[PDB]
Assembly symmetry: D4
Homo-oligomer: 121 residues x 8
């Protein structure tokens, strides 16, 4: 069982951050979300009723990302994860990756971030 619905590279502009200036200025927020769903039925039938619309999942990711400001990425991801696993019983697991290639971190890197993995129960 390893089928996966993916939303990779979703980049939004959020004012989240533990800093004060961040929650002022904001910055692009990269978010990758893969959902453990089985597309054997979806694949057999070819009907939505057999899977998760990646457009709806997009918007849910969207609601949380540009929603109120948070402090950590853990917040934003734990909120997407529970918005995804509590909206679709079709999604066994929902891992959320959020990168910030624009932090107030003096240096050169392709970005910092976190990446959670939540199943449903």
């Amino acid at each position: 069982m390893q089928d996966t619905i993916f939303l990779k590279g979703m980049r939004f502009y959020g004012y989240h951050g533990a800093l004060s200036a961040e929650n002022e200025i904001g910055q692009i927020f990269k978010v990758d979300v893969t959902l453990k769903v089985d597309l054997s039925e979806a694949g057999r039938t070819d009907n939505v009723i057999d899977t998760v619309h990646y457009g709806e999942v997009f918007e849910e990711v969207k609601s949380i990302m540009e929603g109120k400001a948070v402090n950590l990425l853990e917040h934003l991801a734990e909120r997407i994860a529970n918005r995804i696993n509590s909206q679709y019983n079709r999604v066994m697991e929902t891992k959320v990756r959020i990168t910030k290639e624009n932090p107030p971190i003096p240096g050169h890197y392709d970005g910092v971030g976190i990446e959670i993995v939540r199943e449903n129960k």
Copy 2:
């Protein structure tokens, strides 16, 4: 058995999609096909009859994206997932992935779609 034969970034211009305008104007679909098959024999000998003509697989995956339009991308994955599984029993596992960097969805993101993993029967 952790071996694989892959084909990535296969770009096909299909008129698939749920909406009427999509199949009306069409767009690019980016297929990534990964087949899981023992390569020991093939590498030991060195004759395609021991492996799977990945060039063939293209035409097989390609006869599904330039083929008949449809709704769900999972379909397009299933159609390719099945066609490749069937015509080759040596293929233990089949990974068909299809991306749409350009679906009609207000927003910036690098691409979306679904991924499915199939085994041989």
Copy 3:
């Protein structure tokens, strides 16, 4: 526990390397640090005291690449692997990766180095 906190592409100009000319002219090292840590609490609350200041981690990984030169890249990984492991017990697993796209080696290739995975003790 499949959660993580990452930092990728950290570029540091260190004079490390086995050869004498390397530490003589130096080159770019590309560190990718992935820490495995529960983010549920952090995301549940939303306060760094519940997670790991990844900005801190930079300065920690960075105090190893701009620090004292050495021979083996594995060293540089170990030094960072240890420093981060120690100063944070919340860090279950630590992944330090260091790439050298420019080592003195006749040939075309995009980059090389090693990767090591550490757990907390």
Copy 4:
């Protein structure tokens, strides 16, 4: 146990291929090789005697790649895998990926190929 020595993106010019014109014209051959080695000792000491020189591994990959022409990628990979696992008892597993983004395959794709995984016994 998940430390890994990596050589990613090594691109060579080989005349390998099952075609006749290929074995005539040749084409760039991409090769990724990750070696299951434990860098805990290497990391603790900081001495070569504790790991595999990625330069030697490079050359071995190099010998096979520009060596005599072969037919499949299975050949080239199975030969690198057994050149790596029979030269270093320090390498538990050796997976070899070889991409050919230049095959005689009428279409658009980011390349075709295989990817083997061999342990040592």
Copy 5:
């Protein structure tokens, strides 16, 4: 006077296009506008009033692309042009480049667009 102020890579998702289908689906548009200004005083004095706030420049392009639906990229760039030309006595010329990466044309390409060069009177 080769000094310039630019906004390369501006991406907006509009419903522009001479075909109703594209007027329904919409698509990511990409624009680059490079202003011909004299950054002499701004350079010594360091007073933004001695230059053109590009962020305010981004607005005038955002309002146009994020605005109503239109037919040609030419017009999209037409209002861009004067919109800035009329608002800032600071800029001598407005160079607008508009790209449609995924137009309603069947094929494989970078993108398609136009670039107009308008000064001030």
Copy 6:
């Protein structure tokens, strides 16, 4: 009149080339295009009839590239340049470029290629 209608990176899998082998293998041909079209009232009205529909231009470049094989890129660019020149009085000057990223050449490069610039007569 610096204006233009550009069609970047059109990639066609052609069987052209000076090598009889190449014509059996095939390879992608990346084409750049830049027709100088006075887009004054094209933007004025917003009626494509007052300008060149690149799409048609694309399909015309396509008929060339997917046509039967020739040896030089120069003949290809010319059969293309000729096509446009003899279809759009709108086009003051045509500009074709046909890069070669996979020709039979033992070496490392991003490609080789010719570029021509023809006007109307």
Copy 7:
């Protein structure tokens, strides 16, 4: 004399910007450089003393960018352009560009930035 000594994409983590916040957060500043240097006998002899050592130029651009904060990019490009102009008679003309890929601007773009071109007097 079209010659030049160019220094592309120099990235410095500066605390500059017109926003008091920015100066606390910090951000990368990407700098482009292109000094017009008559490299006639520079290539003739092969004595760098008969030309400009870009390295020095780099470290001189560095002293600027890693210096204390200012508000405009224009002052930065000027403190840089001034530096070169007043150090190398070799340089007939200087050319600075300081892109901004992470400024406080709710929008999607590859960056914004000014570019100046100064000569010697």
Copy 8:
């Protein structure tokens, strides 16, 4: 006569450089040479003799870069220039661009190089 024949992205690993250290380690060099030729007849006739074999052009650059050790990029480009200028009465100008992506300068940048433009007499 804006027609051109080019070799953009030529990568060679030499031991060039004015510092003995770089003369010991070596480094990937990148060169682009765009020839000013008239592809008129080549275009209609399609006879390679009516043009300049770029593959033979790649040779003359390979021999120079893969050749002896030198001091300045200027010279590396100096022999490139005439080497082609003298060998082909077909080309009017040889435009050589040489880049050193990872020079012996401490910092973060794209690359450093020079570009000379020489015609024929």
